[PDB]
């Protein structure tokens, strides 16, 4: 009889299961194309994309819910707060990278695909790769915050 849920990769002794939420073709395609999962690309470029996307979002909540939301200084204060949060997150990423990775060691990413094919391990799991990722993320986040502020308060676009 047809059954949907199966053990992970056919091994019933590994602590996971394969469900439509995890292994649907649409879901599998969507996750494989996000920057965090492009193991064959320069980490700087993935970090720049992640920073751009995350910095663009942060402006909205700070602007709209902030203590100066009902004043003429709403946009500038919100954007400045978003930039500060981006700076704090960049500091956290740098600290994590320094703590976790040692210079000169090989990558610790897995080198086996789900079908058993051998692949080159991800370079994001090295000190140099994480440093590039963090420096891309900072530059991306600042650029996204600036773009959001520019669009919202330099061009009088019919938003809302």
């Amino acid at each position: 009889t047809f059954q949907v849920v199966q053990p992970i990769n056919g091994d019933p002794f590994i602590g996971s299961l394969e469900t439509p939420v995890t292994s649907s073709p649409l879901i599998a395609w969507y996750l494989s194309n996000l920057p965090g999962y492009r193991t064959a690309v320069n980490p700087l470029l993935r970090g720049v994309e992640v920073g751009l996307a995350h910095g663009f979002f942060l402006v909205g909540p700070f602007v709209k819910a902030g203590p100066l939301r009902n004043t003429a200084y709403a946009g500038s204060a919100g954007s400045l707060a978003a930039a500060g949060l981006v700076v704090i997150l960049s500091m956290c990423l740098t600290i994590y990278g320094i703590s976790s990775f040692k210079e000169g060691e090989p990558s610790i990413a897995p080198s086996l695909t789900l079908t058993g094919r051998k692949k080159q391990p991800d370079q994001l799991q090295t000190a140099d790769g994480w440093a590039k990722f963090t420096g891309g993320f900072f530059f991306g986040g600042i650029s996204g915050v600036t773009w959001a502020y520019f669009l919202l308060y330099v061009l009088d676009l019919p938003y809302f």
Binding site: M91, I95, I98, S99
Partner: protein
């Protein structure tokens, strides 16, 4: 005076961050 406008943020936001980062790096260190 204008001094409290500097020292209060300096002691509440900058020094705690520096101390926490240094202490985390110290406790995570191995040889």
């Amino acid at each position: 005076n204008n001094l409290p406008s500097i020292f209060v943020p300096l002691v509440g936001l900058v020094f705690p961050a520096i101390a926490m980062a240094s202490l985390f790096l110290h406790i995570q260190k191995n040889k």
